[PDB]
Design a protein around this ligand. Sequence first.
Ligand SMILES: O=C([O-])c1ccc[nH]1
Ligand SMILES: O=C([O-])c1ccc[nH]1
Ligand code: NA
Ligand code: NA
Lengths: 310, 310
Amino acid sequence: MKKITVIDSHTGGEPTRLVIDGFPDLGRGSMAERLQILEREHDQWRRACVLEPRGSDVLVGALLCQPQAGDACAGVIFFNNSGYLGMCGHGTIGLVRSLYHLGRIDQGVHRIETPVGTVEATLHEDLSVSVRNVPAYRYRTQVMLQLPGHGKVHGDIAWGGNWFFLISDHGQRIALDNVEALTHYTRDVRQALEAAGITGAEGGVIDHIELFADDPQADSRNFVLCPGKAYDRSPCGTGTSAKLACLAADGKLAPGQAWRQASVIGSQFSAHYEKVGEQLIPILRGSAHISAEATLLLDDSDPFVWGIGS
Amino acid sequence: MKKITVIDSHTGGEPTRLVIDGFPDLGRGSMAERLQILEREHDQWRRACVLEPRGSDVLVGALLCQPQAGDACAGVIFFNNSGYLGMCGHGTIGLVRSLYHLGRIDQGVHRIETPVGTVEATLHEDLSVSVRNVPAYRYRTQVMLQLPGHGKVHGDIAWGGNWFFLISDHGQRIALDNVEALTHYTRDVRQALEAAGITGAEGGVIDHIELFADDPQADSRNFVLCPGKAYDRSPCGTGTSAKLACLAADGKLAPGQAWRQASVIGSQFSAHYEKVGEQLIPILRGSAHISAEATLLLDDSDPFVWGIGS
Ligand SMILES: O=C([O-])c1ccc[nH]1
Ligand SMILES: O=C([O-])c1ccc[nH]1
Ligand code: NA
Ligand code: NA
């Protein structure tokens, strides 16, 4: 039995499996270079960690890495049931809260290396975490999409640390009891995007889809389809970052102004942005809670030792 | 803060969360009496253990209990995302394999108390487990059912440790890549059963639905919808038990004869039955593997400490 030592947490219901020991050595390169090696040479390990039976389709994993920079407290690579993420907001909140749980950091400011750049997390007195994310921006606005059976929708294409399509005119009901219909709708959206050749910058695959609606207890409520067709239980840190860039460009949110984003299950992030140069810097605040301390055990006689399915 | 100590395993891909410490005390009564107490007074604990975010909709839990009988090695209560099970074949295989992992038993024959009676498990040299289940029987045969959009189907109503509706003339393709349509189909079947007021013996709610099909490498492949609308990744021990009773009554399987049942994801059980009196005793053999050793942590500040959702 190979062993993988993890701290499982969740942020607003969205889980993070922080791998603290047991994965193959990925060398001493950047987090982006280590991601390439992990995917190319050791992708079976991602599958063991986060697919059924030892994980779940909902699960996002985070491999804790020694960072290159002396002033960074950690590096991380994020992954899910289908592949690799860029940044991960809920995941970074989970990582920091987990490092605190392990006694490796205290309250204060920490820099975390990721495959898309270094972010800065503040662990507050209440143990919530603010993440100063990589820069966010809108690439295209009100891109028209024909949805069979639904008709035309318009969406923004925006980068928040992953690529998102953001839709307000969907006409769908956003609530936990409707996640089946919402999942089908957003799958159809991604299909339509793929059909029409619509990408982000430099042919970036738009693999996250988010729908927005009014909420009586927040500025907005969202539903977010992740690359592997599981939904985000949280308001989605990178997704909300993309949203801030869109609001700003539309003249609807100024620097420093708070924006409360509720998730499909009612959890909340508060967010604002700062302007540095031409760049918009999204800052997200939320809380994670520890779910479990676990050691995954990989039995060589188990036919699903490297995970179930395709 | 509060801790729940578990051994997670899976049987042919179907997970079992064996709770070995941390649940409230349920007294010294029978397993059935303890189930009553667990559900009435402590159902939040089931939810904390097996619902999101610390569990999954797929997960079946098994609370380890001290048995009443001096010659029993353990008692168990089984539960899922919706409520409580009776017996659980895959879960018993997982329990026995987990007790061996913990060094609490060795290879040989063990009696396990359950809410529907005592079963006998044999842990073999290859670490597979044979479970001699409680008696099984067919209650009604070829019950007619109109399915709006399909229509009509015929099924058997049978007890294998839980109540099942068993269908062969469904016209559905049974494979992992089709679980979405299979889930809808069985949901409708159950919908139709409730509509017509169809039950098992003494008003027994038929809460498991199973479809059967031919298989090139087994006698049959099945899809099993569990009470909480998750599917069984295993061939389903109690489900296959019910199947043996139906086959026997139809003159299609004699005592001692092997029946190989494949699951929707390709895992297999081998099964046969023995005849004692007017009773049919189903015997199921399969293998579990350990997934993880974990300590669930229940943070009082966590909004979802007792689980997400309805
Ligand atoms: O919080 C996020 O940034 C995220 C991306 C995918 C899932 N969660
Ligand atoms: O294996 C079984 O008996 C079972 C029942 C529900 C899920 N698995
Ligand atoms: Na509002
Ligand atoms: Na066959």
